[PDB]
Design goal:
alpha/beta, Diaminopimelate Epimerase, Chain A, domain 1, 13 helices, binds chloride ion, unknown function
């Protein structure tokens, strides 16, 4: 029983790598990163999880990301401190040329998308869990390859463009707050393309079916619910399980703190209705800007001018945290709110 830790990028190529890897590994935890700070955070998370595991065989798999020399050095050095740990990086970005030729585990091929590199590496070394799936999995891989390298003649090119936009626009589950549910959703949507690959007009057929499919994958009923209520309902349900970690206290009022969620009017109104014990909702983004909402039980205009140099209305307001310190660790973000609220 070998434990796989799979870190990948966030676009179609990045998530398709993880569709592929889940076809091979019964014991796998996935991670995603966009830019460099997030990549380092995920590498720390992965090494931390491996240090705390009780298993003995491990594979660190990194796809569709390039590391700078310092992060590649850190990875190599860290796994030789105080367990059998294999590492394989698969990528196609020419920016990593120098780093690739300094590490035997760092593999660069600029002529293929990362998903195809992952597939051929895993297929050479591991049995696919369900050998019937190959008849749709290899076409799906090739489709991703064709659009990623923009081969207008390659198999599945036009359908792949639909899938690329699908991945970009399936943002109904905030990635920071709901990392696993965000990945499951996108991967469910991408896998459903297997029911279109062999249609005569696959690109258009999938393109026109996707919206209804998204509503269903989010747990909604597309015949009686709008997308904006399906998305906010799916998110609030996931937020309701986080009440103890995300609770913050301003004077005598209790609030719920989220991060990077953006436009929160529908979301917060629904959360506060379903959870009447909360007085306000507060979301912060990476630049320190703050959105506050209430349902009559907390003047968030007064709150944000006491705490965030801001203003608005009794039930909706904004502001900013000067010197706010971005992070991919939710506790780090919460401590910053707590410190502000503590003197309030
Ligand atoms: Cl969280
Ligand atoms: Cl809870």
């Amino acid at each position: 029983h070998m434990q796989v830790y799979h870190l990948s990028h966030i676009d179609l190529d990045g998530y398709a790598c993880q569709l592929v890897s889940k076809q091979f590994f019964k014991n796998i935890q996935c991670y995603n990163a966009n830019y460099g700070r997030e990549v380092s955070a995920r590498i720390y998370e992965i090494l931390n999880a491996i240090a705390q595991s009780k298993e003995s065989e491990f594979l660190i798999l990194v796809s569709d990301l390039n590391l700078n020399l310092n992060e590649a050095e850190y990875l190599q050095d860290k796994i030789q401190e105080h367990k059998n740990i294999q590492i394989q990086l698969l990528d196609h970005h020419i920016s990593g040329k120098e780093v690739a030729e300094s590490f035997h585990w760092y593999f660069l091929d600029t002529n293929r998308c990362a998903t195809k590199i992952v597939y051929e590496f895993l297929k050479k070394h591991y049995a696919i869990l369900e050998p019937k799936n190959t008849t749709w999995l290899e076409p799906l891989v090739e489709m991703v390859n064709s659009v990623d390298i923009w081969d207008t003649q390659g198999y599945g090119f036009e359908l792949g463009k639909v899938c690329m936009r699908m991945i970009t626009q399936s943002s109904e589950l905030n990635r920071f707050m709901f990392d696993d549910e965000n990945r499951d959703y996108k991967l469910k949507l991408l896998e459903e393309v297997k029911n279109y690959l062999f249609l005569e007009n696959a690109p258009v057929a999938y393109d026109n079916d996707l919206f209804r499919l998204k509503k269903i994958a989010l747990g909604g009923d597309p015949d009686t619910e709008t997308m904006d209520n399906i998305s906010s309902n799916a998110q609030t349900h996931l937020l309701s399980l986080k009440k103890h970690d995300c609770s913050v206290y301003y004077q005598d009022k209790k609030g719920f703190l989220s991060y990077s969620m953006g436009g929160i009017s529908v979301l917060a109104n629904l959360f506060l209705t379903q959870n009447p014990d909360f007085d306000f909702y507060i979301d912060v983004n990476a630049k320190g800007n703050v959105s506050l909402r209430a349902n009559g039980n907390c003047d968030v205009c007064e709150l944000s001018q006491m705490c965030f140099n801001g203003g608005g209305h009794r039930n909706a307001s904004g502001g900013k945290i000067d010197g706010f310190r971005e992070s991919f660790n939710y506790r780090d973000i919460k401590e910053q709110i707590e410190e502000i609220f503590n003197n309030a």
